[PDB]
Amino acid sequence: AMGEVSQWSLKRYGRFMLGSPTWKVFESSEESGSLVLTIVVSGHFFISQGQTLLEGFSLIGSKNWLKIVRRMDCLLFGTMFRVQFSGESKEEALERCCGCVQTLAQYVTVQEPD
Amino acid sequence: AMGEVSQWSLKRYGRFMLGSPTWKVFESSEESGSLVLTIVVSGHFFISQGQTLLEGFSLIGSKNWLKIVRRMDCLLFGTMFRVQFSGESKEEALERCCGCVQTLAQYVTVQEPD
């Protein structure tokens, strides 16, 4: 909303968990609540579903420990979690994703797949 | 949730608006959604109701332009908005308020009423 934050809505978020599941996958539901990726101008990164914070860390000095890769409208974050931007079409999601890459890339490099 | 943020729930938030209302008052409802005051470790301050950001600014260098006053379990913010912390009792609300004052006071001074 503000000029202090940028925000993008997500279709999905998945936490690498490593019985023993590999992923815990969160989706934007009417009940569950909507997924938002937030980047604050000081360089803080959050993912939130409604009001619970699923992810929260500084992007400052993340060159040292953080790896981001984009495949189309998804980002993978490693050192692990995975995010997919929403939209009514593949273009609209991709356009969301790219806008976010633009702010993310101010702090880290966003690589292409290996 | 994280170690990157502190969060407190609010009973009420009121925006000074100056037909011509003086205040717009937001409350924690089941429909409307719950009020959260968030302070991020880089010094960013937010109030949010569900996922809408009602307030968002930096506390860094706010000594120059920002005035905070505490009356019991409420804070008034001027240069204007007003916040009241929640709790099952007056003590619990006051205890919430004070915890927040403790992080706020790292950036600004929190005055007593005039």
Residue numbers in the entry:
A (entry chain B), B (entry chain B): 13 to 30, 47 to 107, 115 to 149
Direct quotes from the study:
Then, using limited trypsin proteolysis, we identified a stable fragment (residues 15–159) that was suitable for structural analysis. We determined the crystal structure of this REC114 N-terminal region at a resolution of 2.5 Å by SAD using the selenomethionine (SeMet)-substituted protein. The final model, refined to an Rfree of 30% and R-factor of 25% included residues 15–150. Unexpectedly, the structure revealed that REC114 (15-150) forms a PH domain, with two perpendicular antiparallel β-sheets followed by a C-terminal helix. Several residues are disordered in loops between the β strands. Mapping the conserved residues to the protein surface revealed that both β-sheets contained exposed conserved residues that could be involved in protein interactions with REC114 partners. In the crystal, the PH domain formed extensive crystallographic contacts with a symmetry-related molecule. Indeed, this interface, judged as significant using the PDBePisa server, buried a surface of 764 Å2 and included several salt bridges and hydrogen bonds formed by the well-conserved Arg98 of β6, and Glu130 and Gln137 of α1. When injected at lower concentrations, the protein eluted later and the molecular weight diminished (21 kD at 5 mg/ml). These results could be explained by a concentration-dependent dimerization of the PH domain with a fast exchange rate between monomers and dimers that co-purify together during SEC. Several conserved positively charged residues in the two β sheets, β1 and β2, important for the interaction are not present in REC114.
Programmed formation of DNA double-strand breaks (DSBs) initiates the meiotic homologous recombination pathway. Meiotic DSBs are catalyzed by Spo11. Several other proteins are essential for meiotic DSB formation, including three evolutionarily conserved proteins first identified in Saccharomyces cerevisiae (Mer2, Mei4, and Rec114). Here, we show that mouse Rec114 is required for meiotic DSB formation.
